[PDB]
Amino acid sequence: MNTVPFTSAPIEVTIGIDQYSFNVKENQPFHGIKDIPIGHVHVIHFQHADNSSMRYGYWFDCRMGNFYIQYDPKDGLYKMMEERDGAKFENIVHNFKERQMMVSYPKIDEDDTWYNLTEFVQMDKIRKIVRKDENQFSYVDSSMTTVQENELSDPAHSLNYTVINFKSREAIRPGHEMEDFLDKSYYLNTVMLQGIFKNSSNYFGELQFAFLNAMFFGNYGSSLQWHAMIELICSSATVPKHMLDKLDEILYYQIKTLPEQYSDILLNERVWNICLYSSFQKNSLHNTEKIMENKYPELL
Amino acid sequence: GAMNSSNYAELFNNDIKLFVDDTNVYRVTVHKTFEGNVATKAINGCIFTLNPKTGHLFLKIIHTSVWAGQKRLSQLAKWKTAEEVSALVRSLPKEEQPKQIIVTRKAMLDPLEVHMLDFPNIAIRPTELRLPFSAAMSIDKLSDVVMKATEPQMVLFNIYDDWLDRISSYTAFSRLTLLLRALKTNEESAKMILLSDPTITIKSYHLWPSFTDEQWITIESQMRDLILTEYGRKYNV
Ligand SMILES: CCC[C@H](C)N(C)S(=O)(=O)c1ncn(C)c1Cl
């Protein structure tokens, strides 16, 4: 079990750790988060009590280093940092636990939610979507735009998601205009899966990462990306059976985990009704369609 | 964005454009089968492509053979339309190519956008006008070439005859739309109006009779009356 210690908590902030969150008061004696499950990526995220504008956070994998949080009073935010002195780190963390100034990652033993939301997400891929190679963790916030959004402005602070565009020469083979636009199998299987992603796990990993950034940060370009990657599968007549079955599981847990009140901005009516009721795969997402209809019947 | 009353005169500026109407691409007669069920029998159609500034109508005749063994023909028709338009844009040199194509039905936007990806600098636009181009098959010489075709064919027509010799393209487009609106609302009355007087002939190279200016004003008046009336006759007013 790993730990992300905090130097202190100088400003009042709602701190999130994966799907959990807790309020820390200004200068409350908070020294971070323990018992973080090894083997998964994690995200620790922040919303200041003073400025609910800009949720922000850090994706990290505790196997990649010892990481801590330290508030920066100049830049005005909780910053993740790496401690290279492993001995110094263990020592500090041991002390903080002794004084019990750390919250415990509150994982219920029945609960596979986080595994199921991050099954295919890998830090190495996160770090290529979020380019900042001096660090082993990745900063995202609400306002970051995607490489695709910049085509339609600072390239350093972008989300370099894979550009999907259904009305593009990459999506459409000369000679199969109608065929490729109505059945996107070529674009999914040849261009994207075989060509760019290499395999369905990397595709699902980006899809899952896009959703989580949309959910935790209200990142609009991420939500667009999540929906694009869903729609590309649902609009392909030819999809490996294992991908469909796993897609259904992936989306099920995303829909299950979405806050009830946020469904109106994070869920594209057109994409979902098309995917559940018009697309080739309208009959192939049984779990997703059942949870959607019982939880968000309004949208449909 | 969309073409409407407010940007109406853009049609007559010096940026070459085309209006594309697909309403006569896929045409069927509906009949009863021996077993008493219903079947369709396709008949030849056309893509009504009009340069609204000069008058040229690049009529691409859609022979029934293009539908043989195809499913979802109303959807294919939009893509066939797009494919034929794209082919015209490609055959043309860059300077002669249209800067914009306006489709008369929004269902053509995606098919044409997709077929025109090779031409990202050609704007594809819808319109909010209810243009009467579906009545182009009520022009006898156009209907005739379409029904007689035995193979795919493209025939170039001037839908303004020689009018631009005397009137502007704004005025010629208005005359055309009035004539087509009339023909669409009551083709019989409309055609009687146009051909009542034997002495006024349709030149062999023309589509409409050789009306003088004064005769066009009477004609245009009568077509208005027709359209106003048919509108009464319809709503009882
Ligand atoms: C998109 C339109 C392309 C054609 C080739 N034009 C340039 S035209 O419609 O003005 C035209 N001008 C003269 N002709 C005989 C034609 Cl036809």
From Swiss-Prot, chain A:
Q: How is it modified after translation?
A: Phosphorylated on serine and tyrosine residues.
Note the InterPro entries from the entry. Answer: AAR2, AAR2_C, AAR2_C_sf, Aar2_N, AAR2_N_sf
What the entry lists under Pfam families is as follows: AAR2, AAR2_1st
Q: Name one GO cellular component term.
A: U5 snRNP
Please identify the protein, giving its name as recorded.
A1 cistron-splicing factor AAR2
Is Secreted among the key words of this record? no
Q: Which organism is it from?
A: Saccharomyces cerevisiae (strain ATCC 204508 / S288c)
Q: At what positions is Phosphothreonine found?
A: 257
Positions of the UniProt region annotated as Leucine-zipper: 244-265
Its subunit composition reads: Heterodimer. Interacts with PRP8 (via RNase H homology domain and MPN domain), competing with BRR2 for the same binding site. Component of a U5 snRNP complex that contains at least the U5 snRNA, PRP8, SNU114, AAR2, SMB1, SMD1, SMD2, SMD3, SME1, SMX2 and SMX3, but is not a component of the U4/U6-U5 tri-snRNP complex.
The protein's matches in Gene3D superfamilies, at most eight in alphabetical order, are given as:
2.60.34.20, Aar2, C-terminal domain-like
The alphabetized list of GO BP terms reads: spliceosomal snRNP assembly; spliceosomal tri-snRNP complex assembly
State the UniProt keywords alphabetically: Cytoplasm, mRNA processing, mRNA splicing, Nucleus, Phosphoprotein
Source organism, top-level taxon? Eukaryota
Query: What more does the entry say?
Result: Present with 7330 molecules/cell in log phase SD medium.
Q: Where in the cell is it found?
A: Cytoplasm; Nucleus
As stated in the Swiss-Prot or TrEMBL entry, residues carrying the post-translational modification Phosphoserine are: 236
Curated annotation (Swiss-Prot), chain B:
How changing residue 21 to A affects the protein? Alters protein folding. Severely impaired growth. Strongly reduced growth at 35 degrees Celsius
Which compartment or compartments is the protein found in? Answer: Nucleus
Q: Where is this region: RNase H homology domain?
A: 7-237
Query: What are the disulphide bonds in this sequence?
Result: none
Report further notes: Present with 468 molecules/cell in log phase SD medium.
In the UniProt entry, what is the domain comment?
The MPN (JAB/Mov34) domain has structural similarity with deubiquitinating enzymes, but lacks the residues that would bind the catalytic metal ion.
Tell me the subunit arrangement.
Component of the U4/U6-U5 tri-snRNP complex composed of the U4, U6 and U5 snRNAs and at least PRP3, PRP4, PRP6, PRP8, PRP18, PRP31, PRP38, SNU13, SNU23, SNU66, SNU114, SPP381, SMB1, SMD1, SMD2, SMD3, SMX2, SMX3, LSM2, LSM3, LSM4, LSM5, LSM6, LSM7, LSM8, BRR2 and DIB1.
Task: Write out the function statement from the record.
Answer: Functions as a scaffold that mediates the ordered assembly of spliceosomal proteins and snRNAs. Required for association of BRR2 with the spliceosomal U5 snRNP, and the subsequent assembly of the U4/U6-U5 tri-snRNP complex. Functions as a scaffold that positions spliceosomal U2, U5 and U6 snRNAs at splice sites on pre-mRNA substrates, so that splicing can occur. Interacts with both the 5' and the 3' splice site, as well as the branch region. Has a role in branch site-3' splice site selection. Associates with the branch site-3' splice 3'-exon region. Also has a role in cell cycle.
The protein's name is Pre-mRNA-splicing factor 8
Which source organism? Saccharomyces cerevisiae (strain ATCC 204508 / S288c)
Gene of origin? PRP8
Q: Write the span of the intact protein that is present.
A: 1836 to 2069 of 2413
